[PDB]
Design a protein around this ligand. Structure first.
Ligand SMILES: CCCCCCCCCCCCCCCCCC(=O)OC[C@H](COP(=O)([O-])OCC(O)COP(=O)([O-])OC[C@@H](COC(=O)CCCCCCCCCCCCCCCCC)OC(=O)CCCCCCCCCCCCCCCCC)OC(=O)CCCCCCCCCCCCCCCCC
Ligand SMILES: CCCCCCCCCCCCCCCCCC(=O)OC[C@H](COP(=O)(O)OCCN)OC(=O)CCCCCCCCCCCCCCCCC
Ligand SMILES: CCCCCCCCCCCCCCCCCC(=O)OC[C@H](COP(=O)(O)OCCN)OC(=O)CCCCCCCCCCCCCCCCC
Ligand SMILES: CCCCCCCCCCCCCCCCCC(=O)OC[C@H](COP(=O)(O)OCCN)OC(=O)CCCCCCCCCCCCCCCCC
Ligand SMILES: CCCCCCCCCCCCCCCCCC(=O)OC[C@H](COP(=O)(O)OCCN)OC(=O)CCCCCCCCCCCCCCCCC
Ligand SMILES: CCCCCCCCCCCCCCCCCC(=O)OC[C@H](COP(=O)(O)OCCN)OC(=O)CCCCCCCCCCCCCCCCC
Ligand SMILES: CCCCCCCCCCCCCCCCCC(=O)OC[C@H](COP(=O)(O)OCCN)OC(=O)CCCCCCCCCCCCCCCCC
Ligand code: HEC
Ligand code: HEM
Ligand code: HEM
Lengths: 64, 70, 49, 242, 60, 386
């Protein structure tokens, strides 16, 4: 079988294209990390909060 | 704990000779307006500091979090 | 109705509980004994003559 | 902002609502998923076998299923610890012998008890569901020590348990596609029933008595007004101006 | 109305009759509200009950 | 004398109940803020009955306490109802008494001749706090263990006697089974002392009668207690029952911390340790000081000021209706007290240190300011006269 949940998570890109492009800018900015202790965790959390909020009301209808 | 000589006169009516419920909802809007106009200052003084402190804390926390990023 | 509800609930709280009632039906093995003598066996909470 | 862990959203569960009940087929499938995937390291130890009759199985199924397993019993006349198959008044078996063995078999990490796992953390239902379905690729700039996995729904960012829910990890008896999400939903329904077995009786009593007591409040208010009518319309003359 | 006066004269010239009336009304209203709430509960969520699982007897 | 009997309600057998419940004279303009004493009495009775029936299924040992609570909830007919009533009735009881206290503060009920009533009320409040804190332990969860540790080890900040009294209190070297069994016995005992103090409180009030929303002499217009205030109490009780049962039946865990469903484990510490919701003002005042001795000895001014309000002797008008400035100060104090409550449940860093150190200053400026209105307003008739 194929997971419905991942299908919806990959569907919801237009909702937070803005957070997606922000995270892309973060990773392009950090590109070239020397000492470590630099990361893009905040944009990660923003992005996945967007995606989860998109999927929340839609997911349980598809299930049984 | 004692009493006082009074000299008053009173008239009364029986309970079972008068309409009871219709008094609650008679003229509500004027009563509401009177209460609001009388206690607006108490409401303001009760609810001011909470709003001010909450807004200040929210602003400070979001500023700090967004300044710690990379 | 309120008084009856509360009285009955408080009274029923003190009756035998589901855990105790589950342990009320089973049998164990018994064996032979000497002529005219007795040796008891074990059950739920009660012996056997 | 990484030490707290991501926030689990709110989902429309079929047992939410003021007049809603458990979906017992979901309980059945969740118990199957637990007993075939999860009982390898976790344990319940609070739920007995007899709890399931009338809730997800008939009595005979539970009797045979309990007769599958072996548990120990106290001394015979000899003085030995023997074993005999299970009964209706036994509890869900444990996979280890103590917590020390549990930590030994997982790398020093103890897998907790799942009896109350929904009530014990903040926002139980959604936390457990999003935790199960949340293993993901770590963000740029962070690394995880070997022997650990990444999950944003864990406070710390790095967890010890490995992913289990995978497409086809179990095979139902009703013909439902065993997707990760379906399995997770059934598991969470089972765990919610296990934590709060009294929900439906609670809600029935609540509805009945709220309604009845509202009626009594109406009557008491009328009683009050009727008694005070005599004083509250009294007239008096007093002989004073200022 | 006049029905209220008729009920008043029928039931409240004594007191033990009043006590019996109160008890009877209680132990009738209890049953009526029980029936009503049970029926609404059954109506709200159909198909989820214990006697509605399609595989209840296929683990023999 | 009355050489033949008239009524059963005036015979010697029922003289006390009649005189103090049925025929007692009360002002006729008492409002709904005068029902919370009776309502709190009913709350105390509910607590006592529910506890006497919970203590038939609970075993005070470290191995068994958690499992015995869960046995009650899962295996006894209706036991979940008993536990939910107890664990939520504590919260209802605290709510009602807080409203009672603030009523007393508004219409200035502590002044003469009613300061014995205020002092007995403060003593009752102390007993209530001790009883609730001792009884939050016996379930033996995570918060039970760590709250007991923090609060009862806060008593080693005192000079030389400190460690000795802490070790004598704990019955040993750490919070363990001895402390559990000790606290269980104290919890079963204290509420009867609470009952006795409540009865003494009521006698002390009945020897002068109650106040009224006007604060004037009230001996010319009084009505009996029954049936005029019995029916008003009835309305209050039914509304309270509706509220209580909304808590019990449809949201019985909103007013607690989730961490008490994890059995006590002395090695790992929770990341955020707090006590119940009705100790957070004291808790915030207590952590507001960067010093152990100062932090512990800052609670003492709270109780000293609460116990020394009645003895200022210049103010002449009681009710806050005719006192605009004291009324505004009352509302501002209420806001500040809520702010302390909210702060008491936060982590200790910026920006909460300043907001945890200033509200104590305001909470003490309240008890400092009020005599100044007393003096400055004692001479008010001479200026505004017509
Ligand atoms: C023989 C002599 C009898 C006699 O003298 O009659 C006196 C008197 C009537 O005298 P009467 O002059 O002959 O009757 C004239 C009127 O027609 C009489 O009419 P009435 O107006 O006096 O009757 C009103 C009364 C009618 O009921 C009755 O009196 C009979 C029952 O209504 C109630 O009793 C309400 C019940 C109180 C329950 C409220 C509980 C509060 C919250 C509960 C917990 C919430 C969690 C859920 O009876 C009463 O007034 C009853 C008083 C009851 C108050 C007792 C307080 C109990 C509170 C304890 C509960 C604590 C919680 C426990 C857990
Ligand atoms: C600061 C002190 C400000 C007040 C100084 C003296 C002013 C005297 C006065 O009358 O202030 C009036 C005002 C509210 O009082 P009032 O006019 O009765 O408004 C009722 C509307 N329903 O104000 C008040 O009565 C309360 C003033 C608040 C006191 C704040 C103290 C800090
Ligand atoms: C948990 C703690 C929660 C605390 C709740 C606050 C309790 C405060 C009790 C104060 C006693 C009180 O009733 O104050 C009444 C006050 C004015 O009432 P009063 O002037 O006495 O009567 C006039 C009749 N028209 O009423 C007012 O001044 C109205 C103020 C209302 C402002 C909030 C909106
Ligand atoms: C018809 C007869 C039956 C009627 C039953 C009505 C039941 C009411 C709903 C029960 C319930 O579950 O309430 C949920 C609520 C959630 O709690 P919370 O998020 O804090 O909401 C408060 C927002 N200020 O929990 C509560 O807020 C409980 C407090 C209710 C009183 C608030 C006023
Ligand atoms: C946490 C540690 C606490 C340790 C103790 C701390 C105490 C701090 C208290 C500080 C407040 C000051 C107290 C001063 C008391 C006496 C002051 C006073 O004014 O008394 C005098 C007054 C009558 O005298 P008067 O008529 O005014 O003078 C005549 C002049 N020609 O007298 C009166 O008016 C009579 C009033 C009597 C009411 C007060 C009785 C004492 C309070 C009762 C509470 C105690 C109950 C405890 C019950 C359990 C006991 C363990
Ligand atoms: C608070 C009440 C005081 C309780 C207290 O301080 O107990 C400490 C001690 C009694 O116990 P303790 O002497 O420390 O036993 C250990 C023996 N090596 O205290 C004593 O030795 C005597 C206590 C007398 C004072 C009790 C005051 C109440
Ligand atoms: C005498 C007064 C005694 C009152 C004692 C309790 C006061 C309020 C205690 C409290 O905790 O209320 C604040 C409540 C808690 O918020 P919470 O999310 O649990 O804390 C952060 C953890 N994530 O968060 C809430 O907003 C719930 C509302 C509680 C009542 C309002 C609190 C006033 C201050 C809020 C704005 C500042
Ligand atoms: C490989 C053995 C194993 C399997 C099988 C297993 N777990 Fe875990 N589980 C663990 C370990 C180890 C931990 C402790 C994680 C830690 O402390 O980092 C854990 C922890 C958890 C937690 C606690 C998370 C938290 O936030 O504290 C939950 C919830 C959980 N598991 C759910 C499940 C569910 C649901 C299943 C069935 C799909 C399952 N587990 C199956 C090993 C397992
Ligand atoms: C178990 C706790 C308590 C009980 C049972 C209780 C009960 C009562 C009752 C029944 C009354 C008279 C009826 C009424 O006026 O409503 C009263 C009056 C009063 N109580 Fe309490 N109370 C308690 C706690 C407190 C506390 C903690 C305080 C103060 C800190 C307090 C202060 C007062 C005051 C000032 C009055 C005066 C009433 C008036 O001004 O007319 N009480 N109490
Ligand atoms: C004779 C009187 C009382 C007895 C016998 C009693 C008994 C008990 C028992 C056995 C427990 C443990 C059971 C459990 O925690 O679920 C408990 C808990 C508790 N008690 Fe009492 N109690 C009494 C009065 C009171 C009073 C008057 C208060 C508060 C004013 C109170 C507050 C509490 C609290 C807050 C708990 C915590 C329960 C929880 O949070 O889970 N008790 N009591």
């Amino acid at each position: 079988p194929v997971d419905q949940k991942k299908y919806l998570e990959e569907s919801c890109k237009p909702k937070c294209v803005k957070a997606l492009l922000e995270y892309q800018a973060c990773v392009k900015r950090i590109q070239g990390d020397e000492t470590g202790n630099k990361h893009c965790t905040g944009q990660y959390f923003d992005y996945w909060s967007c995606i989860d909020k998109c999927v929340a009301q839609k997911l349980f209808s598809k299930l049984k | 704990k004692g009493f006082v000589p009074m000299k008053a006169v009173t008239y009364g009516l029986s309970p079972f000779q008068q309409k009871i419920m219709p008094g609650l909802w008679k003229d509500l809007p004027t009563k509401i307006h009177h209460k609001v106009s009388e206690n607006w200052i108490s409401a303001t003084l009760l609810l001011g500091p909470l709003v001010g402190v909450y807004s200040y804390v929210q602003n400070y926390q979001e500023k700090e979090k967004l300044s710690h990023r990379y | 109705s309120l008084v009856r509800l509360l009285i009955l609930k408080f009274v029923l709280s003190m009756s035998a509980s589901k855990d105790v009632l589950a342990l009320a039906s089973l049998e164990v093995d018994l064996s032979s004994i000497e002529p005219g003598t007795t040796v008891t066996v074990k059950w739920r909470g009660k012996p056997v003559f | 902002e990484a030490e707290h862990g991501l926030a689990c959203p709110s989902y429309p569960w079929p047992h939410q609502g003021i007049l809603s009940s458990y979906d017992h087929a979901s309980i059945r499938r969740g118990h199957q998923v637990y007993t075939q995937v999860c009982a390898s390291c976790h344990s319940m130890s609070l739920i007995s076998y007899r709890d399931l009759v009338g809730v997800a199985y008939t009595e005979e199924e539970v009797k045979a299923m309990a007769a599958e397993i072996e548990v120990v019993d106290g001394p015979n006349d000899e003085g030995e610890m023997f074993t005999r198959p299970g009964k209706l008044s036994d509890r869900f078996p444990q996979p280890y012998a103590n917590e020390a063995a549990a930590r030994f078999a997982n790398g020093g990490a103890y897998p907790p008890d799942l009896s109350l796992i929904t009530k014990a953390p903040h926002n139980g239902q959604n936390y457990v569901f999003a935790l199960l379905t949340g293993y993901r690729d770590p963000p740029a700039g962070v690394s995880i020590r070997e022997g650990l996995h990444y999950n944003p729904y864990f406070p710390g960012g790095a967890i010890a348990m490995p992913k289990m829910l995978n497409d086809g990890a179990v095979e139902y008896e009703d013909g439902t596609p065993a997707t990760e999400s379906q399995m997770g939903k059934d598991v969470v329904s089972f765990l919610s029933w296990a934590a709060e077995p009294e929900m439906e009786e609670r809600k029935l009593m609540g509805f009945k008595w709220i309604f009845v007591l509202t009626l009594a409040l109406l009557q008491a208010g009328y009683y009050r007004r009727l008694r005070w009518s005599v004083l509250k319309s009294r007239k008096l003359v007093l002989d004073v101006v200022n | 109305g006049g029905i209220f006066e008729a009920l008043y004269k029928v039931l409240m010239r004594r007191n033990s009759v009043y006590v019996t009336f109160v008890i009877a009304g209680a132990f009738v209203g209890e049953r009526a509200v029980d029936y009503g709430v049970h029926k609404l509960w059954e109506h709200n969520n159909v198909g989820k009950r214990y006697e509605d699982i399609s595989v209840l007897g296929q683990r023999q | 004398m009355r050489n033949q009997r008239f009524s059963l309600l005036k015979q010697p057998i029922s003289s006390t109940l009649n005189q103090h419940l049925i025929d007692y004279p009360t002002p006729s303009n008492l409002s709904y803020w005068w029902g919370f004493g009776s309502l709190a009495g009913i709350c105390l009775v509910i607590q006592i009955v529910t506890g006497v029936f919970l203590a038939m299924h609970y075993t005070p040992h470290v191995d068994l306490a958690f499992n015995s609570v869960e046995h009650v909830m899962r295996d006894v007919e209706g036991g979940w109802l008993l536990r939910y009533m107890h664990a939520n009735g504590a919260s209802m009881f605290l709510i009602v008494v807080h409203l009672h206290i603030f009523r007393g503060l508004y219409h200035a009920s502590y002044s003469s001749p009613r300061e014995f009533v205020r002092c007995l009320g403060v003593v009752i409040f102390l007993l209530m706090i001790v009883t609730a804190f001792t009884g939050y332990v016996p379930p033996w969860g995570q918060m039970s263990f760590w709250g007991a540790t923090v609060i009862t080890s806060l008593a080693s900040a005192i000079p030389v006697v400190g460690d000795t009294i802490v070790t004598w209190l704990w019955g040993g070297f750490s919070v363990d089974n001895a402390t559990l069994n000790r606290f269980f016995s104290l919890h079963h005992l204290l509420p009867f002392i609470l009952v006795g103090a409540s009865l003494l409180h009521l006698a002390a009030l009945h020897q002068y009668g109650s106040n009224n929303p006007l604060g004037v002499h009230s001996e010319m217009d009084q009505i009996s207690f029954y049936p005029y205030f019995y029916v008003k109490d009835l309305v209050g009780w039914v509304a309270f029952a509706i509220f209580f049962s909304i808590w019990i039946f449809y949201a019985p865990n909103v007013l607690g911390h989730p961490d008490n469903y994890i059995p006590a484990n002395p090695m790992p510490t929770p990341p955020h340790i707090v006590p119940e919701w009705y100790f957070l003002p004291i808790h915030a005042i207590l952590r507001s000081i960067p010093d152990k001795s100062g932090g512990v000895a800052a609670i003492a001014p709270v109780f000293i000021c609460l116990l020394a309000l009645p003895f200022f002797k210049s103010m002449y008008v009681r009710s806050s209706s005719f006192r605009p400035i004291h009324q505004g100060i009352f509302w501002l104090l209420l806001a500040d007290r809520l702010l302390l409550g909210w702060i008491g449940c936060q982590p200790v860093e910026a920006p909460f240190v300043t907001i945890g150190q200033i509200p104590p200053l305001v909470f003490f400026l309240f008890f400092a300011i009020t005599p100044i209105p007393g003096r400055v307003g004692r001479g008010i008739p001479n200026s505004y006269t017509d």
